[PDB]
Ligand binder design. Sequence first.
Ligand code: DKA
Length: 218
Amino acid sequence: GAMAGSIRSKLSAIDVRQLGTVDYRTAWQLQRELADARVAGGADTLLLLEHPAVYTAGRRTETHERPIDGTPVVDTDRGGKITWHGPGQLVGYPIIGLAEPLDVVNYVRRLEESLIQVCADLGLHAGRVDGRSGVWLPGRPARKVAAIGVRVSRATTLHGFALNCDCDLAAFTAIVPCGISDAAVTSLSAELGRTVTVDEVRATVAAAVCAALDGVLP
Ligand SMILES: *[C@@H](CCCCCCC)CC(=O)O
């Protein structure tokens, strides 16, 4: 099915870089540098990092979705509307050459599957809500544990995902996150009733992403 096989143009090992806390702009610059290196024939890369607290807005963000307290926002070129990154949220930036003709939806679906599996491996039952990319726990309201916002340029991916581990969720209350006003944002820690850190899930996230891209998630 759609998840089988590989989305990649080259079957070489992904270079996984476990970074620390990296300013949003600095990381964005590195993403672009790595993407150019990939087009020049270099490796596929997966950056895993945390950002200092920041709101970011893709082009589709609407004015009323911005912080109700006037907090500044970084405009960014990924898909999606507004989100927040900060301590305790694991941000992943897969910088991957995709096979052409492109299937960006399938790429997003593979990132979702990777994070669904990470949740499953912790004993949680997460999945998709069609039309609302990312990873959700069912409920009324439904609870979003991971966000996705990507862009593909020159058949190479940019941006990625963000998995809420033990971050303070209060930042999400000041915005309309990803254009959604009828739901909620959660974290692994809130769902499991214990602190689940970024560092505890770094390795399993890396493994899951790399497996999903090549169709070999368990
Ligand atoms: C809202 C934005 C989520 C961006 C996540 C970026 C992770 C690096 C998505 C939407 O509007 O659908």
